[PDB]
Design a protein around this ligand. Structure first.
Ligand code: 478
Lengths: 99, 99
């Protein structure tokens, strides 16, 4: 699709067999989702945003369905105001910005 | 142009007669620029994201040239770690997210 930006670019994602809403965020380097249980071991990671840094849990090789497109990669879990799909996954689905 | 997301989508902008580098951010509702002097009255506002909230000054009807494209709208000025071009101005230049 071609998504205009008059409204927040929200899509449905499927992760852990659950359906969730997420923001397509070109300004986020990584993908961060709200607290949920994911499989595997995690590593610590410091993530910087508008108000400073936070501590999140990094899970690798996670299967995630983004607006019907399947992707497999790194997902961070932590206290985010909204589920964000960052560049790491946007590239996997071949998303670009055009103007 | 067609911007791939392997790297951060930075562009050159012109605001208040100064040249700055900024992030084309679909996850940002509004544009936020690092501390600078702008003409006009302004209203204080609080903006939040990852890491909490920052206090900014809201300037209205500011003209900004985004990669050679002139646009007009609200600009928030404050202690942001990076200059962000949000949806309020991306729409004006006809930017879309495609996949
Ligand atoms: C958190 C989302 C919902 C909103 N933010 C936009 C996001 O694109 C934000 C942009 C940014 C990049 C680098 C440093 C600081 C900020 N990236 C972000 O947090 O990157 C983290 C998450 C994964 O990788 C690192 S915002 O900055 O809080 C914001 C809020 C309101 C306005 N009007 C403008 C901006």
């Amino acid at each position: 699709p071609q998504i205009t930006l008059w409204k927040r670019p929200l899509v449905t994602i499927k992760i852990g067999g659950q359906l969730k809403e997420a923001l397509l965020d070109t300004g986020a380097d990584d993908t961060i989702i709200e607290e949920m249980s994911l499989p595997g071991r995690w590593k610590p990671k410091m993530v910087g945003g508008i108000g400073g840094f936070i501590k999140v849990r990094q899970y690798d090789q996670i299967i995630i369905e983004i607006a019907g497109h399947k992707a497999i990669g790194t997902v961070l879990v932590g206290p985010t105001p909204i589920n964000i799909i960052g560049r790491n996954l946007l590239t996997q689905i071949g998303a670009t910005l055009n103007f």
